[PDB]
Design an enzyme around this catalytic site. Structure first.
Site, PDB file in Angstrom:
ATOM      1  CE  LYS A 161      -4.225  -1.735   0.215  1.00 44.90           C
ATOM      2  NZ  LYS A 161      -5.306  -1.349  -0.734  1.00 44.90           N
ATOM      3  CG  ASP A 189      -4.421  -0.969  -3.707  1.00 43.77           C
ATOM      4  OD1 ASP A 189      -4.800   0.123  -4.176  1.00 43.77           O
ATOM      5  OD2 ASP A 189      -5.207  -1.865  -3.336  1.00 43.77           O
ATOM      6  CD  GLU A 215      -5.779  -3.387  -6.174  1.00 46.54           C
ATOM      7  OE1 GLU A 215      -4.756  -4.014  -5.834  1.00 46.54           O
ATOM      8  OE2 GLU A 215      -6.925  -3.703  -5.780  1.00 46.54           O
ATOM      9  CG  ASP A 240     -10.139  -2.144  -5.822  1.00 49.48           C
ATOM     10  OD1 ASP A 240     -11.209  -2.776  -5.954  1.00 49.48           O
ATOM     11  OD2 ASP A 240      -9.553  -2.035  -4.725  1.00 49.48           O
ATOM     12  CE  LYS A 264     -11.209  -4.907  -2.714  1.00 48.92           C
ATOM     13  NZ  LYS A 264     -10.713  -4.329  -3.999  1.00 48.92           N
TER      14      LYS A 264
HETATM   15 MG   LIG Z   1      -7.201  -1.950  -4.252  1.00 52.80          MG
END
Ligand SMILES: [Mg+2]
Length: 354
Positions: A161, A189, A215, A240, A264
């Site tokens: 991240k 991400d 991402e 995403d 997701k």
């Molecule tokens: Mg993501």
């Protein structure tokens, strides 16, 4: 088979460490757990993971919605997933968390009734999946240290991240890279943290660091900007937050906005919709990765795992929510042990019990 009753309960699981991303922080896995009882006695399990800073959904709203759904589907056959979604969709114009919880329980029942592990009903491509493990934003040297740890556990891919600023972020990656090696795959991400041009700059900066993919680099609503990035770097760009459902997916493939799409269950409202997204992506030549919300647990992760293993075009997996759980809310399913290999068994449905 007929639905006799639907029960829903709150679930609060303490996380072993406070997780942090560009959009916010989280310290407890709070979700809605559903149990759907059929007239014959079979009971399917489902979960609704609300992510306030991803989808805007809340546990309170999710619980309320699930209750409305539960009363509206009594008497229906779990195999009539088509009507079940029709019913939920007419009730609410937007509640992916609630819908996924009902959806997942219905598929669990389907598997249990057919006496087949769920992955067999979803495509049967594989009976196991390999997941990466994420590293929440922190200090370059701290993340690099945790990387070595996860790698020691057996992980070959790491989700990193970033989002505090192209400056610190870049430092973060390089640090971690020359800490574990080059055999380890590293996906990044940035949760919408960068602007188009600063995104191109940051990515190119890590040109010699061998990044697998990046991402959601820009704001979920800035589609023109996201495509700008995708079309400037040769690096793989994944969408995403810019892709919640099938209609979103169709828009992205049409505009050719990204290279890969993150699915997701808590964003699309269940397996039924996830199947649609993957189909649209496969047909367009776009692979998919199956992700998760930090708040979901064993049930949601298990459901996602069965889908990932079953579908060929779901080539990557980020199902690490159960790795940060202090305790298990249910029995069976994907263990909380931090291990990259999630093997699904021959148990019917999700293989989960009280
Ligand atoms: Mg993501």
């Amino acid at each position: 088979m007929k639905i006799k009753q639907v029960h829903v309960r709150a679930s609060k699981i303490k996380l072993k460490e406070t997780f942090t991303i560009a959009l916010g922080t989280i310290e407890s896995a709070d979700s809605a757990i559903v149990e759907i009882e059929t007239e014959e006695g079979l009971v399917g399990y489902g979960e609704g993971g609300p992510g306030i800073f991803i989808t805007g959904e809340t546990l309170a709203g999710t619980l309320e919605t699930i209750e409305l759904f539960g009363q509206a589907i009594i008497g229906l056959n779990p195999f009539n997933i088509e009507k079940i979604h029709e019913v939920m969709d007419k009730i609410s114009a937007f509640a992916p968390a609630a819908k996924a919880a009902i959806d997942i329980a219905c598929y669990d029942l389907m598997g249990q009734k057919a006496q087949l592990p769920l992955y067999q009903l979803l495509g049967g491509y594989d009976n196991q999946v390999i997941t990466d493990i994420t590293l929440g934003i922190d200090e370059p040297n701290v993340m690099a240290q945790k990387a070595v740890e996860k790698v020691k556990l057996g992980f070959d891919t790491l989700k990193i991240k970033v989002g505090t600023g192209i400056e610190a972020d870049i430092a973060r990656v390089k640090a971690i890279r020359e800490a574990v090696g080059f055999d380890i795959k590293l996906r990044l991400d940035a949760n919408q943290a960068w602007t188009p041009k600063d995104a191109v700059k940051a990515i190119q900066a890590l040109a010699d660091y061998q990044i697998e993919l990046v991402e959601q680099p820009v704001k979920r609503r800035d589609l023109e900007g996201l495509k700008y990035v995708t079309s400037q770097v040769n690096t793989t760009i994944m969408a995403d937050e810019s892709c919640f459902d099938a209609q979103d997916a169709l828009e992205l493939v049409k505009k050719g906005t990204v290279d890969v799409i993150n699915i997701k269950l808590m964003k699309c409202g269940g397996i039924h919709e996830a199947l649609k997204i993957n189909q649209i992506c496969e047909t367009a030549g776009i692979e998919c990765m199956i992700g998760c919300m930090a708040e979901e647990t064993t049930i949601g992760i298990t459901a996602a795992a069965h889908l990932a293993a079953a579908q060929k075009n779901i080539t990557r997996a980020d199902l690490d929510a159960t790795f940060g759980l202090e305790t298990a809310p249910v029995t069976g399913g994907v263990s909380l042990e931090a291990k990259p290999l999630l093997e699904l068994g021959e148990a019917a449905g999700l293989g989960i019990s009280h």
